[PDB]
Design a protein around this ligand. Structure first.
Ligand SMILES: [Cl-]
Length: 398
């Protein structure tokens, strides 16, 4: 690789390394409950053994219909450890959207919990259902499994809707690269306390989760109640001394910097209209303006707002992150000089395999990269231009 990362390693192997190195550090917190790395790894290994007995193997698509909880994290790690891919089903979605996704994914096994079991019955799922908080796993072996795995294996499938819902197929490789990117560029260490803002069916939530779990850091799962009340959100971050959070700009605009002291890095996805937000926070923490679709593992470019500088008027999306490439091209995929507007196309290790059972759309969006023969590049449909200082400005849709 151009920039070193843990090549040849799967997501669960990177987690197992952290669990070995920091067994007693806190791994996940949800309300009054918490698990250390060792307790989390042990529980995930027991469930992984049960999943293996049910047929979970390479590229098996395991549906997950669970609350934003510690059990959902155990389920994710267990699916990965068994060698399968997890497909989170957003339990807030209307019944018909869940039914469409279940049918499209063709999943033969759904992992759920007691409080979500009636929803699984109501969506009429006829495959195998494992109710995790009804499964007797406490007697199973707790050691790591060591199932065969390659970084090109499917790790997860994220569904999103814009026509019909489509599943983006993400492999282990991009998340392994993001582990090194977060450690290098965000300074992530085991001392960090990371808030999980997004619900676990969103690709950005999977990314936030592994930003903590692949570095020995703690992940604080923020409840719906904490998020719904701005004062409660500020108090939760302050009480628990959270150091990293990724938020949407529309949520960040309601927060008071004085009420949050502990944050060392804040990541958000905005453009020029977020200049007042950047100017307000850039001097209080490391402000990161990030850009990256699900199709490239939720990361593509970053711009850290220079702190010791006068107010900015424009907010770029920055430069490509390690082992990724950005191209600004015209309709014929020809490169454009500075100042010329074109389509943002992304290459490199974060690229999705494609869209689940959508071969024509996959071929249309993940095209041959003419600049790096033998590789693909993703056509974002986003308009952008290079600035002469070498940063990219986001301009909307093509
Ligand atoms: Cl191993």
């Amino acid at each position: 690789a151009l920039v070193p990362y843990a090549q040849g390693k799967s997501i669960h192997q990177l987690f197992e390394e952290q669990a070995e190195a920091f067994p007693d550090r806190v791994a996940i917190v949800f309300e009054n409950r918490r698990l250390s790395y060792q307790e989390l790894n042990r529980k995930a290994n027991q469930l992984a053994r049960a999943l293996l007995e049910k047929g979970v193997q390479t590229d098996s698509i395991v549906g997950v219909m669970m609350e934003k909880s510690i059990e959902n994290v155990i389920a994710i790690l267990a699916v990965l450890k068994a060698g399968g891919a997890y497909v989170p089903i957003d339990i807030e979605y209307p019944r018909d959207r869940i039914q469409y996704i279940l049918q499209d994914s063709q999943t033969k096994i759904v992992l759920t919990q007691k409080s979500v079991s009636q929803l699984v019955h109501d969506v009429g799922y006829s495959g195998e259902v494992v109710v995790l908080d009804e499964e007797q796993l406490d007697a199973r072996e707790t050691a790591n499994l060591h199932q065969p795995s390659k970084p090109t294996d499917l790790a997860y499938v994220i569904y999103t809707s814009g026509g019909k819902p489509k599943g983006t197929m993400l492999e282990h490789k991009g998340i392994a690269n993001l582990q090194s990117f977060f450690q290098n560029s965000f300074g992530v260490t085991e001392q960090d306390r990371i808030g999980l803002f997004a619900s676990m069916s969103f690709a950005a939530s999977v990314s936030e989760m592994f930003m903590a779990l692949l570095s020995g850091a703690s992940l604080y799962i923020l409840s719906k109640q904490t998020i719904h009340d701005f004062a409660a959100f500020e108090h939760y971050l302050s009480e628990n001394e959270l150091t990293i959070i990724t938020l949407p700009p529309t949520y960040l605009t309601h927060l008071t910097p004085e009420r949050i002291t502990s944050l060392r890095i804040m990541i958000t996805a905005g453009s020029a209209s977020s200049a007042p937000l950047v100017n307000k926070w850039k001097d209080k923490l490391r402000y990161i303006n990030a850009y990256g679709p699900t199709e490239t593992s939720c990361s593509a470019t970053i711009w850290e707002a220079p702190s010791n500088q006068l107010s900015v008027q424009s907010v770029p999306i920055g430069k490509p992150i390690q082992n990724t490439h950005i191209y600004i091209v015209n309709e014929d995929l020809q490169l454009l000089p500075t100042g010329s507007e074109g389509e943002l196309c992304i290459g490199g290790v974060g690229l999705a395999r494609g869209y689940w059972n959508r071969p024509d759309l996959t071929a249309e969006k993940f095209v041959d990269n003419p600049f790096v023969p033998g590789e693909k590049m993703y056509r974002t449909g986003d308009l952008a231009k290079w600035l002469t200082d070498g940063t990219i400005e986001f301009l909307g849709r093509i």
